[PDB]
């Protein structure tokens, strides 16, 4: 499922991501855009048994268990295929786990390199939410 930017934004606001740990809502939408292109079923095979999953591309070596990755930690205590869903509750709950403080968004390489410092609010402006 590929979300429209406003739809994704309203979903994320519903799940408490707006101003979560001081991160404005646009940060989250921008990160989704660059990580999975808003596709809830995105997957990405890394150079190590690792694989990134769903809309926020959560890693199988540290956050969700796929049981196919050399050394899971499953810190989110969730199966990676839970992340590959139309409903974003799991992805969001794990993301909140990942972002423990105000610098937590660095968890997403695309956000740090393509969102941090830009007008991320641009992604949600004009969205009814």
């Amino acid at each position: 499922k590929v979300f429209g930017r406003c739809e994704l934004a309203a979903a994320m606001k519903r799940h408490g991501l707006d101003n979560y740990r001081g991160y404005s809502l646009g940060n989250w939408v921008c990160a989704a855009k660059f990580e999975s292109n808003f596709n809830t079923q995105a997957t990405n095979r890394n150079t190590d048994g690792s694989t990134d999953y769903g809309i926020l591309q959560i890693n199988s070596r540290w956050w969700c268990n796929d049981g196919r990755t050399p050394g899971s930690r499953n810190l989110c205590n969730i199966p990676c295929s839970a992340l590959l869903s139309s409903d974003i509750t799991a992805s969001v709950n794990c993301a909140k786990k990942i972002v423990s403080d105000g610098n937590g968004m660095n968890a997403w390489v695309a956000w740090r390199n393509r969102c941090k410092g830009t007008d991320v609010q641009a992604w949600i402006r004009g969205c009814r939410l």
Epitope: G22, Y23, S24, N27, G117, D119, V120, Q121
Partner: antibody, heavy 116, light 107 residues
């Protein structure tokens, strides 16, 4: 440690330009915007413009034509270039860092006076 | 431009008193509103951002509330170091603008 330090000419006339410099430290310009704000004597704050981490710029609509903001990421410096000076440009000029829609760190401000 | 109407212009209060400073936006700013305090001859200092979030280090006697177009900064039991000026600024789009300021002074 996050630091913003402004350096300007101090006094200028309606016939020259005006370039104020904002030398930052403790953070990369690629990751944050820097806004320029001024405060006329005994007056409130006035927003001038800003440059985002990506180099895009936005300006106060009224002063947009007299302003130009640029930066050198490697020198950790941001520049406010202003022309067509008026005596109403006399103010304390501040560069402030923008971190996700709030100005969290402000420089000390440089006082500029526009003469005849 | 979205303009902000801040009031009152000046406030005379005693320590221990509670005071409210409002800022009304000419347009909906969607909660992107910050408050700053500027003390005699100092740069402004961030107090509150996104309407309600205190900045790090800011005492909890400061609380912001708002939504839509009317915003308030409340200071409960004001302390000697609270006097000075306060400004609101929006971040709803560019250009950003500030409120005219409120001078909080000793009764």
């Amino acid at each position: 440690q996050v630091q913003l330090q402004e350096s300007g000419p101090g006094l200028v006339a309606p016939s020259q330009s005006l370039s104020i410099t904002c030398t930052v430290s403790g953070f990369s310009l690629t990751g944050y915007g820097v806004n320029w704000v001024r405060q006329p004597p005994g007056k409130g704050l006035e927003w001038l413009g800003m440059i985002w981490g990506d180099g895009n710029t936005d300006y106060n609509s009224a002063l947009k034509s007299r302003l130009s903001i640029s930066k050198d990421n490697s020198k950790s410096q941001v520049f406010l270039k202003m022309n067509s000076l008026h005596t109403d440009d006399t103010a304390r000029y501040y560069c402030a860092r923008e971190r996700d829609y709030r100005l969290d760190y402000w420089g000390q401000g440089t006082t500029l006076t526009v003469s005849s | 431009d979205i303009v902000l109407t801040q009031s009152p212009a000046s406030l005379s209060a005693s320590v221990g008193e509670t005071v409210t400073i409002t800022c009304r936006a000419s347009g909906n700013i969607h909660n992107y509103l910050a408050w700053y305090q500027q003390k005699q001859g100092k740069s402004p200092q961030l107090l509150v951002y996104y309407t309600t979030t205190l900045a790090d280090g800011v005492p909890s006697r400061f609380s912001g509330s708002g939504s839509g177009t009317q915003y308030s900064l409340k200071i409960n039991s004001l302390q000697p170091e609270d006097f000075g000026s306060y400004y609101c600024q929006h971040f709803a789009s560019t250009p950003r603008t500030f409120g005219g300021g409120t001078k909080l002074e000793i009764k």
